[PDB]
RNA sequence: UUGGAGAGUUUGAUCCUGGCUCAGGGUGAACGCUGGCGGCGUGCCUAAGACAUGCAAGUCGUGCGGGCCGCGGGUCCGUGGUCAGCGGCGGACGGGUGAGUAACGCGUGGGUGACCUACCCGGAAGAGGGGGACAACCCGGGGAAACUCGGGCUAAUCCCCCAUGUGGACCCGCCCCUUGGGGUGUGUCCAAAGGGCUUUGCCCGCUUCCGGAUGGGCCCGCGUCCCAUCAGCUAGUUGGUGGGGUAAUGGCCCACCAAGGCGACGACGGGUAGCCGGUCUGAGAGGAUGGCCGGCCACAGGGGCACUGAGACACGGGCCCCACUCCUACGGGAGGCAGCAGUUAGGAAUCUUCCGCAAUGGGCGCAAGCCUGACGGAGCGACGCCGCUUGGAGGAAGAAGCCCUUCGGGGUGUAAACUCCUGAACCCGGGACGAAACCCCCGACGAGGGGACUGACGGUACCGGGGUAAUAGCGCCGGCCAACUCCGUGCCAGCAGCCGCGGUAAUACGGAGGGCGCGAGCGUUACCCGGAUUCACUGGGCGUAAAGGGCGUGUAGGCGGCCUGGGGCGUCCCAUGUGAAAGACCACGGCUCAACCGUGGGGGAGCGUGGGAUACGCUCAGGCUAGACG
RNA sequence: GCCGAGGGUAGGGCCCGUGACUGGGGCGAAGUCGUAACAAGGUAGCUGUACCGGAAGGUGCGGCUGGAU
């Protein structure tokens, strides 16, 4: 299934930090601020200038190893984009966004995305009342995604919303801490979310 | 409609029939050129009036004998012998095309 | 005779009913004359049943067939009504 | 081992022999008219025609022959028969 | 204007030409390793080789007469179930397969004044009076069987004669029309059946005719692959006349008569293929393809033929011939899976002898209802697509083991251990949607309103409660091309798509560590398009790279100067018909999403018709002298 | 009685598989013989044709420069 393994050696290959536990991430005990250079025998040699391919496959499994997902299923969401009206970039995106399992974790349901597909595959979420345990739902605007309230009364979910008080949370999402439910505004344009990343190289991967 | 084409009577030596080549033009749907291709129709003269070099018209009719369909319409045009040998000439030269 | 009836579209556990006229002899599903509506046995739909009735008439004034189950089905959408 | 296709291949048997059985019959009147008519004789050929006509479009009726078949049938004995008495004439009965 | 990437390889080096090779997407796939769940699709591409067994087409007692058994009750009657028979309607639908066919088979646009259509609707009219046969059945003869002949009786919606002629048909005549269309007069010919209830009234049916609707037959224009190392082909051949034949045209068939018909715009011949909607690829143009699904065709062991029929030259009907297999009582007789499963053979390779008529549909029936391997579902196969799992947070300047090291140390690695949190699987309870009709009821057997019966899938999906940390594999790491070190080997063993690797320090072979790529998958083989502007229409070339005919002359053909008018063929525009459905696309919506599926939307070429345009190419006509000749 | 599946007789056409033996061709190679071509390649080369020679080739005739000086 998803990629289920060793998550730091990802960080270290790609040369930057992804997000991709929640706490150890903001703690000095993180591998990149220990060491931020490419795990194994040969990560302390002095590197080789990548090639054009060599880059580009490099900026893709960038974003797609943020989000934990298939390369199918990043194919198709990217050949969908492809597809459909107006500019690639943006609407790649913003439907990678619009999934569920991100959805719950931009909102601070939970702490990583992992954890946030942990939680939908669970049923601990719930999609405009109907429970979804879904990752894959493409979320559309005006939905409301809450916790179940047969499992609100748990440890995990009452203690991830303490930390969202008064929490930013990016502006197409509102939040009713407490209340543990939120809302779908809008699809992001490609201001409102900073992945480390540039999503043009990403199509000139697929124009090879 | 009954489809009605024009066209110049080549041979008949045939009772009650005559021989009436069709020719049309049409761009190549590759190449774009327009093409020249013809035909042969027989036609059925019951009124054993036409003659060799006549250009008429003639419309599809339901069948008289085996391959006759048509009849002939109306006269359009007498005496053109250089369409005739137009046409007689190309037969002609198929004697050095063999062996 | 020709027959007004349910040509079977949709998938499978997943019914949904094209009310047509076809020829009696034709297969279930095959070639038809004219769609007159559609029809969906699990109403999971705000309009389950709708009936080009102007049209339907045309064909019972000149000799179509209704099957029980498709006589019902313009009986519930009215076209038998006076 | 069996069916009801055996009882219809019986029934086709016996309907065989009927249609037959007229078809030679009608075939026998009309040569019969038209052998007399060509000799003519114009009376006994038209009073024979009139039996051959009758069982014609009787045999029309059915199986037999269809609607068609029995009209073209007597527009060819007609016209074989009135035409052969030109060479003669002239047509004692009815008809017509 | 939503659409277009290139690389490796001839050289010491260069530029160019040119091929070979590669990275992409695709498949009814197969093979290797591996393999957890579910949904929807989908699965003999080879031998259209051969097949055990069951099942795939029957139905009506509201057509008739019966035998048996039963309930009734007096040898007889009603009546029930059943079995054949006679008689209806169906069996020409549905289902299968792609052999044959290069063809009016198919596709597309049309013709039919040259045609048909059972059941269905609508319009007009009618049902009077007699007669008769054969099965059932009885009685003889012959077999293991297939069953079979003869003799005798009997009913009907079974066959026949007369009558009626609204009407129809046919010949002759007139009018209209204009290919055999419409009308009419003289003559002639043709109708029919009862059954059942609630019984001087309705329901199912019957007969003649007209129109409708639907399904067809036939005909024409145009489009449809390779070899010209197949160049000439043709005696029913091509036409005429007269007949035969059919629903109907026609050499479709026959007789006679004429000497004709076809061909480099590829006849004839050989090879290959069922064709299309579409599918795949591609920036497009184009190329490739036709499995599933829908339309048409062709075939039903191989051939030939007809019969019954509205319709067949008939898959589970008939006759004959052939090949093949079988059964036998050894005298004789039967079979046709390219229906659904299943066996076998061939093959790299392709499924359960399932459950059900509940639904949709079809056939018979007044109706109940009966039949339905169509169909609805179930089974098997990672074959395909899609969703899903093998957990999540925490957790050392960082255990052991293993790899590397300059022996200081670097790595696998937050990886593990361990802590808490969640709860695939499984256990308990609830439990579908799909199914309201027919029928019954009042009403009127109608309109409408009311009633009850019915679920194979299935105790399944789903809903609720409980609850276990719960499968990971495969390819690659010389350049293309993402990923590097140690040892072992020593032109050996082996690798290999191309260039190339291996001859004692191989990142290229074998293992290991580490790494890169995907993930219930990953690789391999085969094939299709792409990269290949490498058949070049878009969009290439020929002095020396492959490529100007040795040179003339001329046939067909392609192509053509300046001015003016007629036509309007090509060409452009407008209006209209067709361009089915599924699919493609855009929006929305239903299955928790998706795959899948529903609803709506938008078109196009191309062809038929009507009208318009006239510059260019065409044609016709009249001029000119710049081309050409004298 | 005609036509007629097909069976039988006779002679022809195209294609396929195969055949003692035979002709050259591709590849392999660490073999034998010579040295024809590339330098004026030690007789400038190539060429059609003709005759000849173990083999590359030679020579005649005419042609080309894609021949050094
Ligand atoms: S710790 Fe640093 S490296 Fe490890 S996952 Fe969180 S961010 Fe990536
Ligand atoms: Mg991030
Ligand atoms: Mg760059
Ligand atoms: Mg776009
Ligand atoms: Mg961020
Ligand atoms: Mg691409
Ligand atoms: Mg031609
Ligand atoms: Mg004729
Ligand atoms: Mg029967
Ligand atoms: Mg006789
Ligand atoms: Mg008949
Ligand atoms: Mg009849
Ligand atoms: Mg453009
Ligand atoms: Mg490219
Ligand atoms: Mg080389
Ligand atoms: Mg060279
Ligand atoms: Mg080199
Ligand atoms: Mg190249
Ligand atoms: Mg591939
Ligand atoms: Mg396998
Ligand atoms: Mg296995
Ligand atoms: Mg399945
Ligand atoms: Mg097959
Ligand atoms: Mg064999
Ligand atoms: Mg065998
Ligand atoms: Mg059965
Ligand atoms: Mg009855
Ligand atoms: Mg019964
Ligand atoms: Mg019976
Ligand atoms: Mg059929
Ligand atoms: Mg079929
Ligand atoms: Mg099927
Ligand atoms: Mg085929
Ligand atoms: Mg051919
Ligand atoms: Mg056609
Ligand atoms: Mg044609
Ligand atoms: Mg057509
Ligand atoms: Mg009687
Ligand atoms: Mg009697
Ligand atoms: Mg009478
Ligand atoms: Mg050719
Ligand atoms: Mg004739
Ligand atoms: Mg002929
Ligand atoms: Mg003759
Ligand atoms: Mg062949
Ligand atoms: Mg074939
Ligand atoms: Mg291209
Ligand atoms: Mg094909
Ligand atoms: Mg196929
Ligand atoms: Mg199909
Ligand atoms: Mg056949
Ligand atoms: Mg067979
Ligand atoms: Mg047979
Ligand atoms: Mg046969
Ligand atoms: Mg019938
Ligand atoms: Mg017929
Ligand atoms: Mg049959
Ligand atoms: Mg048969
Ligand atoms: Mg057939
Ligand atoms: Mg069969
Ligand atoms: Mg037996
Ligand atoms: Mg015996
Ligand atoms: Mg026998
Ligand atoms: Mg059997
Ligand atoms: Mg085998
Ligand atoms: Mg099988
Ligand atoms: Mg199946
Ligand atoms: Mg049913
Ligand atoms: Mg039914
Ligand atoms: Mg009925
Ligand atoms: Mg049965
Ligand atoms: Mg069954
Ligand atoms: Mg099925
Ligand atoms: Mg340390
Ligand atoms: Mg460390
Ligand atoms: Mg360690
Ligand atoms: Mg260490
Ligand atoms: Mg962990
Ligand atoms: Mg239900
Ligand atoms: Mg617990
Ligand atoms: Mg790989
Ligand atoms: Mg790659
Ligand atoms: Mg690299
Ligand atoms: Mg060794
Ligand atoms: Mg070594
Ligand atoms: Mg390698
Ligand atoms: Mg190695
Ligand atoms: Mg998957
Ligand atoms: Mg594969
Ligand atoms: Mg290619
Ligand atoms: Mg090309
Ligand atoms: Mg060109
Ligand atoms: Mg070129
Ligand atoms: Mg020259
Ligand atoms: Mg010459
Ligand atoms: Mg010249
Ligand atoms: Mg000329
Ligand atoms: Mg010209
Ligand atoms: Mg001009
Ligand atoms: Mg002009
Ligand atoms: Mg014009
Ligand atoms: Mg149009
Ligand atoms: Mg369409
Ligand atoms: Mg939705
Ligand atoms: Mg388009
Ligand atoms: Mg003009
Ligand atoms: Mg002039
Ligand atoms: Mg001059
Ligand atoms: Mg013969
Ligand atoms: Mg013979
Ligand atoms: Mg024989
Ligand atoms: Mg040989
Ligand atoms: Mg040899
Ligand atoms: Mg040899
Ligand atoms: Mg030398
Ligand atoms: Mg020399
Ligand atoms: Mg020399
Ligand atoms: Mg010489
Ligand atoms: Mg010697
Ligand atoms: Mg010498
Ligand atoms: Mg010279």
Excluded at chain 1, 39 to 56: E, I, M, T
Excluded at chain 1, 78 to 104: C, H, I, M, W
Excluded at chain 1, 176 to 204: C, S, T
Aim: glycine share 6%.
């Amino acid at each position: 299934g998803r990629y289920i393994g060793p998550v730091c050696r990802l960080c270290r290959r790609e040369g930057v930090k992804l997000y991709l536990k929640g706490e150890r991430c903001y703690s000095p005990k993180c591998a990149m601020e220990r060491r931020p250079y490419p795990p194994g025998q040969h990560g302390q040699k002095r590197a080789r200038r990548p090639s054009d391919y060599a880059v580009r496959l490099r900026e893709k499994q960038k974003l797609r190893r943020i989000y934990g997902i298939s390369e199918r299923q990043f194919r198709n969401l990217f050949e969908e984009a492809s597809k459909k009206k107006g500019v690639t970039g943006s609407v790649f995106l913003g439907l990678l966004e619009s999934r569920l399992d991100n959805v719950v974790y931009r909102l601070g349901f939970a702490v990583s995305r992992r954890q946030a597909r942990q939680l939908v595959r669970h049923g601990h979420i719930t999609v405009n009342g109907r429970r979804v345990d879904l990752p894959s739902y493409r979320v559309r605007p005006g939905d409301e995604i809450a916790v179940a309230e047969k499992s609100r009364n748990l440890e995990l979910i009452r203690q991830n919303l303490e930390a969202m008080k008064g929490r930013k949370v990016g502006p197409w999402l509102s939040l009713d801490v407490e209340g543990m439910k939120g809302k779908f505004l809008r699809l992001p344009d490609r201001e409102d979310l900073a992945l480390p990343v540039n999503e043009q190289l990403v199509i000139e991967f697929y124009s090879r | 409609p009954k489809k009605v084409l024009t066209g110049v009577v080549v041979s008949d030596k045939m009772q009650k029939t005559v021989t009436v080549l069709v020719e049309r033009q049409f761009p190549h749907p590759l190449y774009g050129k327009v093409i020249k291709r013809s035909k042969k129709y027989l036609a059925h003269d019951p009124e054993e009036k036409y003659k060799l070099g006549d250009v008429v018209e003639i419309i599809e009719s339901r069948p008289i004998s085996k391959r006759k369909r048509f009849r002939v319409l109306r006269l359009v045009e007498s005496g053109r012998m250089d369409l005739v040998e137009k046409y007689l000439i190309r037969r002609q030269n198929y004697e050095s095309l063999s062996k | 005779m020709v027959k007004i009836r349910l040509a079977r579209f949709g998938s499978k556990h997943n019914p949904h009913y094209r009310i047509v006229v076809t020829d009696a002899r034709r297969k279930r599903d095959g070639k038809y004359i004219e769609k007159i509506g559609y029809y969906d046995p699990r109403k999971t739909t705000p309009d389950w049943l709708k009936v080009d009735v102007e049209r339907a008439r045309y064909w019972l004034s000149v000799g179509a067939q209704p099957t029980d189950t498709a006589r019902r089905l313009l009986r519930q959408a009215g076209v038998f009504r006076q | 081992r069996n069916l009801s296709a055996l009882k219809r291949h019986r029934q086709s048997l016996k309907r065989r022999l009927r249609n037959k059985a007229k078809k030679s019959a009608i075939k026998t009147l009309s040569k019969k008219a038209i052998q007399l008519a060509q000799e003519g004789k114009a009376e006994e050929a038209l009073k024979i025609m009139r039996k051959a006509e009758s069982l014609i479009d009787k045999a029309a009726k059915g199986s037999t022959l269809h609607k068609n078949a029995a009209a073209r049938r007597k527009s060819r004995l007609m016209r074989k028969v009135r035409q052969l008495l030109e060479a003669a004439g002239a047509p004692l009965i009815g008809g017509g």
